[PDB]
RNA sequence: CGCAAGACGGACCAGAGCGAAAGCAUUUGCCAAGAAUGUUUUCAUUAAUCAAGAACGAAAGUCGGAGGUUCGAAGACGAUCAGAUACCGUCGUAGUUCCGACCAUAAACGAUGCCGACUGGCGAUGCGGCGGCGUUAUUCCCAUGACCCGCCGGGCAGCUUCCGGGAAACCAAAGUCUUUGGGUUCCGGGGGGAGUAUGGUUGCAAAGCUGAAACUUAAAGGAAUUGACGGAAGGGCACCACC
């Protein structure tokens, strides 16, 4: 801290290290993604921190798993961030 | 006036700790306020080790150690010169004495 | 102690006096 | 005082049980099983004042008195089991301990495997003395 | 209850112990097996190298 | 006994050596005469103790330098070693080579030659 | 007993060890010879000898004291059988040190014989070679899982065996050697032993089964 | 060598953890409870502090059963001493332990009400999450665990300094205060008489809660400084000290 930091224009890489509530505008750390299992072929889109066992609408018994944070996928291929 | 920041005791974030008896006084002090000492020494003395290592039945024998854990009340630990009273600012050293 | 024992002595005298009073009446 | 029918090279083994309290010290000695016993000498037999009953000299006077008796029968080498008082108490050997142990290595015997044995409790009963300890 | 005399030679003087500082700590050899060594407490003015005389070589005194 | 020279004996003997160093040899009986000539010591007993410390200091100064006496003949050999040293006519050279994270520190300062590279063992010190 | 010279009435004996051990001669005992009714062979049974391992195999470590009771005498020979192992004190006291976690377990089991054992185990977490934190503490669920594994392994290795095969595993301690490798994908656990074995119930005598061991 | 009983869970055990506080440590199982963390889930002011009232409340102590190993008020002796109704020693009742009812106190202490905002640096540490070069274990894997390097929450703490404050010891709060006002609850007014007298109330009892006045007095007290002393510690010294 230099006693002259300017707050209206924070660092584009520091603004992403502070907690989600504590940056100039609030912004979630979650995102949406299109999972694509091997085998049966559908493009079901899942939340990141899913906390539900989702299913592919077909030939899968499972598609992601709940954890303390981000869901862990079994074999889901693409999972592109959907970027809107 | 207050003499120690920690009241001469380890307890923080706790209500009670089970006591423990001194080893010579048989007093009754908290397990975190007592003065502990681990002692590891040969079962033989260093004067005798060359005589006992001379009349073994076996050729290679490394004699056993004696492990003992001691706890002292404060009065008995000061009467037995285990610790000494220290200068006022020299009271805030936590590192154990040099070997 | 001297506060402890003062308290104890006052307590025992108070007991004696209360007994005397309530036994008188 | 006959012994085994072999005495030439090998060593007929035994066991010591040095009990070394303050107040007094015992040098026992038994056979290899512990059950049957041989001469037993204690520091208070050798000295005539209570204050001396545990001292390095009273212990050195006892170790020899046991060594001569054992050598008289069959026992040439000895195993050692060293005892403090134990049982919610001192659990450190008294002043006779070191002194009796050297005093039979010097007087003929041969020392075997030496071990420490003293009753240590897993949280025993309440120790004598009072909550404020035995003050002096 | 019977032990012969032993003759030791002083090899080093350690310090002057005793309550009035009267006796002297000293380390001795044994003049038959120079391998042995004990620490003894003498009463007169020892120098270095002179032959003491021990009436019981088995003891080893450790303070005043 | 004692024999702990006082600070009035250890200050004469320090000035005298600074002023007269080329007379004060290494024996005591000649120094006992030089000191009697140069300064005024108002006693025989003091004169001898001063001239007896002078000899100690002289024996010591025929080794390395002592930290109370600045003599002329021993300054210049330090002045030399500060003016230059027997080691090099070249500089310790510009031709020296370094490793990553500094190539990019220069990539934003524009350097392009005389370097090297080695990505260090892959976790912090152990 | 202070009648004249009670040591001129004693007879010496031998003491052998079961045929798993190399040095099969433990030592000697002694006993008052047969008198009015207290026959000596009565007095030579139920004697427990505690014998370090090194005086049996001659090639293994000096801790691991075994115990041997006698069961019958055959002409100045005391024949003995397994009774339970322990560990010497100082080895134990010198494993237990600060900034660690001492994991312990125990089970009750039978051999294929009626020998009802009561085992004990002990293990200590490891400071990994590359560490910097001054402590090597385990959580509680990891401890619990390790205990489950330690009880499970230690029961398999006994239930399927006769007394002789389990003693043959105890001699080099293959048990702790196996557990140290099993519990390594939870917490490295640098030290594992079988600190004690107690014999609880033992079946009928069967002299012939005894002489199987000493054959 | 073996049997029985009751209490106690050492070493690991830490300026570590959990709980509203008192308090809580052998294994395994069952029962409900909880903080923190993650969230692009839901309701939409539901909140803070609280007279009256209410739950828990160490040890001792009371009442009725069961038990009774160790320790041990009272007590009986033995020493020590001028005396010793004490310190020390041997013995020993109530008690100490469990079940059911009472009791509501403690240096119950961080001697420091609770809720919210702002104001320096540094390393560690327990829980959760996220990112990352190696090493390591299992099936060669991936997943996961042990380690190593950072970041984010909230937690017990520590070092540091002319932020500032204070009578100072000292405190990152005991700061943002004569440049005085974020919200609200309990409570102090020189020292003693005195937590006494009395009235009420609760309790089987022991006692708790609420609680005066007459009268008497120039000080009682807090932090720090310099001495003198100590049957306190570390060095050193003298035949007006000793050996
Ligand atoms: Mg004070
Ligand atoms: Mg907490
Ligand atoms: Mg608190
Ligand atoms: Mg408390
Ligand atoms: Mg005292
Ligand atoms: Mg029990
Ligand atoms: Mg335990
Ligand atoms: Mg914990
Ligand atoms: Mg109220
Ligand atoms: Mg209670
Ligand atoms: Mg009670
Ligand atoms: Mg009642
Ligand atoms: Mg009863
Ligand atoms: Mg009495
Ligand atoms: Mg008196
Ligand atoms: Mg009396
Ligand atoms: Mg008494
Ligand atoms: Mg008693
Ligand atoms: Mg009460
Ligand atoms: Mg109540
Ligand atoms: Mg109160
Ligand atoms: Mg209060
Ligand atoms: Mg606040
Ligand atoms: Mg973590
Ligand atoms: Mg933290
Ligand atoms: Mg200031
Ligand atoms: Mg701070
Ligand atoms: Mg702060
Ligand atoms: Mg802090
Ligand atoms: Mg404030
Ligand atoms: Mg303010
Ligand atoms: Mg404010
Ligand atoms: Mg007032
Ligand atoms: Mg007055
Ligand atoms: Mg008052
Ligand atoms: Mg009041
Ligand atoms: Mg009233
Ligand atoms: Mg009322
Ligand atoms: Mg009433
Ligand atoms: Mg009032
Ligand atoms: Mg004051
Ligand atoms: Mg001193
Ligand atoms: Mg003198
Ligand atoms: Mg005089
Ligand atoms: Mg004299």
Swiss-Prot record, chain A:
One of its GO terms (molecular function) is zinc ion binding. One of its GO terms (cellular component) is small-subunit processome. Residues 1-16 have a biased composition (Basic and acidic residues). One of its GO terms (biological process) is translation. A zinc finger (C4-type) spans 37-59. Gene3D superfamilies: Zn-binding ribosomal proteins (2.20.25.100). It holds the Pfam family Ribosomal_S27e. The keyword Metal-binding applies. Binds 1 zinc ion per subunit. Transmembrane segments: none annotated. PROSITE patterns: RIBOSOMAL_S27E (PS01168). Belongs to the eukaryotic ribosomal protein eS27 family. Component of the small ribosomal subunit. The ribosome is a large ribonucleoprotein complex responsible for the synthesis of proteins in the cell. Required for proper rRNA processing and maturation of 18S rRNAs. Part of the small subunit (SSU) processome, first precursor of the small eukaryotic ribosomal subunit. Component of the small ribosomal subunit. Part of the small subunit (SSU) processome, composed of more than 70 proteins and the RNA chaperone small nucleolar RNA (snoRNA) U3. This is Small ribosomal subunit protein eS27. It comes from Oryctolagus cuniculus.
From Swiss-Prot, chain B:
GO terms for cellular component: cytosolic ribosome; cytosolic small ribosomal subunit; rough endoplasmic reticulum. It is found in: Cytoplasm, Cytosol; Cytoplasm; Rough endoplasmic reticulum. Residues 86-96 have a biased composition (Basic and acidic residues). Coiled coil: none annotated. One of its GO terms (molecular function) is structural constituent of ribosome. Its main location: cytoplasm. The keyword Zinc applies. Keywords: Cytoplasm, Endoplasmic reticulum, Phosphoprotein, Ribonucleoprotein, Ribosomal protein, Zinc. The modification Phosphoserine is found at residue 53. It holds the Pfam family Ribosomal_S26e. GO terms for biological process: translation. Zn(2+) binds at residues 22, 25, 73, 76. Component of the 40S small ribosomal subunit. Belongs to the eukaryotic ribosomal protein eS26 family. Component of the small ribosomal subunit. The ribosome is a large ribonucleoprotein complex responsible for the synthesis of proteins in the cell. This is Small ribosomal subunit protein eS26.
From Swiss-Prot, chain E:
Its main location: cytoplasm. InterPro entries: NA-bd_OB-fold, Ribosomal_eS28, Ribosomal_eS28_CS. One of its GO terms (molecular function) is structural constituent of ribosome. One of its GO terms (cellular component) is cytosolic small ribosomal subunit. The keyword GTP-binding does not apply. Belongs to the eukaryotic ribosomal protein eS28 family. Component of the 40S small ribosomal subunit. Part of the small subunit (SSU) processome, composed of more than 70 proteins and the RNA chaperone small nucleolar RNA (snoRNA) U3. This is Small ribosomal subunit protein eS28.
UniProtKB/Swiss-Prot annotation, chain F:
GO terms for molecular function: structural constituent of ribosome. There is a cross-link at residue 103 (Glycyl lysine isopeptide (Lys-Gly) (interchain with G-Cter in SUMO2)). Keywords: Cytoplasm, Isopeptide bond, Nucleus, Phosphoprotein, Ribonucleoprotein, Ribosomal protein, Ubl conjugation. Component of the small ribosomal subunit. Part of the small subunit (SSU) processome, composed of more than 70 proteins and the RNA chaperone small nucleolar RNA (snoRNA) U3. GO terms for biological process: translation. Pfam families: Ribosomal_S17e. It comes from Oryctolagus cuniculus (Rabbit). HAMAP family: Ribosomal_eS17. It is found in: Cytoplasm; Nucleus, Nucleolus. Belongs to the eukaryotic ribosomal protein eS17 family. This is Small ribosomal subunit protein eS17. The modification N6-succinyllysine is found at residue 19. PROSITE patterns: RIBOSOMAL_S17E. The modification Phosphoserine is found at residue 113.
């Amino acid at each position: 801290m230099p006693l002259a930091k300017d707050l209206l224009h924070p660092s584009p890489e520091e603004e992403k290290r502070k907690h989600k509530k504590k940056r100039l505008v609030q912004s979630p750390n979650s995102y949406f993604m299109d999972v694509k299992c091997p085998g049966c072929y559908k493009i079901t889109t899942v939340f990141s921190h899913a906390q539900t066992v989702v299913l592919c609408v077909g030939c899968s018994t499972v598609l992601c798993q709940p954890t303390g944070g981000k869901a862990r996928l079994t074999e889901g291929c693409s999972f592109r961030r959907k970027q809107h | 006036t207050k003499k120690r920041r920690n009241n001469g005791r380890a307890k923080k974030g706790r209500g009670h700790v089970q006591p423990i008896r001194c080893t010579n006084c048989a007093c009754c002090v908290p397990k975190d306020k007592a003065i502990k000492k681990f002692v590891i020494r040969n079962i033989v003395e260093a004067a005798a080790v060359r005589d006992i290592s001379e009349v073994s039945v076996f050729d290679a024998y490394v004699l056993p150690k004696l492990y003992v854990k001691l706890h002292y009340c404060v009065s008995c630990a000061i009467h037995s010169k285990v610790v000494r009273n220290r200068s006022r600012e020299a009271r805030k050293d936590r590192t154990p004495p040099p070997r | 102690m001297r506060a402890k024992w003062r308290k104890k002595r006052m307590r025992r005298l108070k007991r004696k006096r209360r007994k005397m009073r309530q036994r008188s009446k | 005082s006959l012994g085994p029918q072999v005495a030439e090279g090998e060593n007929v083994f035994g066991v010591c049980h040095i009990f070394a309290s303050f107040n007094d010290t015992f040098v026992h000695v038994t056979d290899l099983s512990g059950k049957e016993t041989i001469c037993r000498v204690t520091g208070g037999m050798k000295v005539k004042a209570d204050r001396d009953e545990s001292s390095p000299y009273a212990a050195m006077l006892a170790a020899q008195d046991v060594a001569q008796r054992c050598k008289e029968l069959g026992i040439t080498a000895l195993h050692i089991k060293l005892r403090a008082t134990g049982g919610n108490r001192t659990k450190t050997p008294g002043p006779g301990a070191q002194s009796a142990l050297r005093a039979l290595a010097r007087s003929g015997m041969k020392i075997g495997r030496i071990e420490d044995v003293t009753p240590i409790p897993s949280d025993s009963t309440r120790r004598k003395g009072g909550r404020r300890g035995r003050r002096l | 209850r019977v032990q012969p005399i032993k003759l030791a030679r002083v090899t080093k003087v350690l310090g002057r112990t005793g309550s009035q500082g009267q006796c002297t700590q000293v380390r001795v050899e044994f003049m038959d097996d120079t391998s042995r060594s004990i620490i003894r407490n003498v009463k007169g003015p020892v120098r270095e190298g002179d032959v003491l005389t021990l009436l019981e070589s088995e003891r080893e005194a450790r303070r005043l | 006994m004692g024999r702990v020279r006082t600070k009035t004996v250890k200050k004469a003997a320090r000035v005298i050596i600074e002023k007269y160093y080329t007379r004060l040899g290494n024996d005591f009986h000649t120094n006992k005469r030089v000191c009697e000539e140069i300064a005024i010591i108002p006693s025989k007993k003091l004169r001898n103790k001063i001239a007896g410390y002078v000899t100690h200091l002289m024996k010591r100064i025929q080794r390395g330098p002592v930290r109370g006496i600045s003599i002329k003949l021993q300054e210049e050999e330090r002045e030399r070693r500060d003016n230059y040293v027997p080691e090099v006519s070249a500089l310790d050279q510009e031709i020296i080579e370094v490793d990553p994270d500094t190539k990019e520190m220069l990539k934003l300062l524009d350097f392009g030659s005389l370097s090297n590279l080695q990505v260090t063992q892959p976790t912090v010190g152990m | 007993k202070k009648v004249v010279d009670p040591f001129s009435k004693k007879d010496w004996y031998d003491v052998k060890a079961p045929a798993m051990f190399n040095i099969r001669n433990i030592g000697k005992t002694l006993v008052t010879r047969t008198q009015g009714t207290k026959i000596a062979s009565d007095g030579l049974k139920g004697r427990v000898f505690e014998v370090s391992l090194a005086d049996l195999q001659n090639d293994e470590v000096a801790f691991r004291k075994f115990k041997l009771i006698t069961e019958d005498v055959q002409g100045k020979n005391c024949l003995t059988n397994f009774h339970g192992m322990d560990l010497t004190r100082d080895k134990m006291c010198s494993m237990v040190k600060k900034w660690q976690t001492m994991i312990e377990a125990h089970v009750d089991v039978k051999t294929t014989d009626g020998y009802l054992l009561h085992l004990f185990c002990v293990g200590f977490t490891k400071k990994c070679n590359n560490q910097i934190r001054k402590t090597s503490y385990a959580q509680h669920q990891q401890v619990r899982q390790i205990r489950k594994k330690m009880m499970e392994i230690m029961t398999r290795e006994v239930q399927t065996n006769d007394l002789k095969e389990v003693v043959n595993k105890l001699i080099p301690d293959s048990i702790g050697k196996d557990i140290e490798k099993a519990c390594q994908s939870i917490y490295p656990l640098h030290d594992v032993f079988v600190r004690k074995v107690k014999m609880l119930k033992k079946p009928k005598f069967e002299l012939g089964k005894l002489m199987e061991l000493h054959g």
